[PDB]
Structure formats: structure tokens, C-alpha cells
RNA sequence: CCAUGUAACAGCAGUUGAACAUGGGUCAGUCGGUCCUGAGAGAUGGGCGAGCGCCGUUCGAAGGGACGGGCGAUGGCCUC
């Protein structure tokens, strides 16, 4: 909605800095970025990505910490899995921020797709090359 | 010892093990040692001994420590 049409929720765009009521600008990314964190921390629950699921993986790979047992897997796990999947996608969220505000090529979202993927595939070719 | 995992050995076997492999576990003023000397062991003095040494353990100028006083303690500058 850019013209002639509902402007109740709209992204900024402006060159520089747009601001005559904050109640909409500071709104919108309090809602991108928590979206984001509850987008990240249900992905894991259902991709079978959490510390739970994780572990039956060392497990069945019979990887073990160094001086714990098999169930003291999850708990460490924990300490670090759930929640870089708040901050993580919190991160994420907050680099589109930073990239829309900016206005860089792509209209800010949608680079971030790109970067990744692009970084995505570079471990496979440092890997394939000793 | 504990947990996990798993040819030789456990005079049969084993999916089991004090076996093998990986990794953990023993927290003290108050429970012990540490202190005492007991039977005894054993230095120093001394004696003996070719000598390494050993006999001897009370048979030698064997005290090194005491609140109290003055020179100088003056030192905090004199309370202790």
C-alpha cells in the first residue's frame, strides 16, 4: 500500500529519514523482529533441529561431551540451542531493519536470502578443494 | 568405584562381567594423621676401633630463657 490504498501497515520508505508519527515507524520493526524470534524458535520445534533432537543424533553417531553422560547432551545443548534461535532470528530480523532503513540494493529484504545461500554453498566448495 | 558402549579372558555360554574401550568420581577447625611417650630405636660428649665405623644414652664449661631499673631502647617518639 503505497498510494490510494490502506495504509494502517505499511514498511518505511523514504531516501534518508521519514518521521511524522513514530507510533507507526517504531512499530513496525518491534513487530518484524518478533515475528522473527517466534518465526526461528518454532522452526526448530518442528524441524527436528532442537537440543532434543540433536542429541539422538551424536547419540546414534556416538558422539559423547567430554565429561558428561548422554543425557547431560540436551542440558548443554539447551544452554546454547533455544536460545540462538531467539537471538539468532532477532538478528536476522534486525540486519532487514538495518538493510531497508539504508535503502541498499534490493530494497534491503530479500539480500539477506542471498548472502546466506551464497555462504551456504561456499562451505561445499572450500571442502571439495582439500 | 560410577555411567555409557562392546575379538581375547570369565575351563559351557552370555545380549552379562572385578574383562575390554571411552569418559567421570574421593570436598573437613569438629573423622583421622599431625602432638605424647610405651617396649624400644638413636645422635652429641666420651671411649674403642687398621678402617667403613660401633659402644654407650647420662654415663661434658650440656641454661640462649624469666615480670621487674638506668645508661641509648627514645619508636611508634615512650599507653604496650
Known sequence: PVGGLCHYLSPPESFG???????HAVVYIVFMLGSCAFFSKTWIEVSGSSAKDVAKQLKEQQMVMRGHRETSMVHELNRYIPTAAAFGGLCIGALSVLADFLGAIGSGTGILLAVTIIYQYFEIFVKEQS
Do not use: A, H, K, R
Open 17 to 23: 529519514s521519514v518521521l511524522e508519527d513514530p507510533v
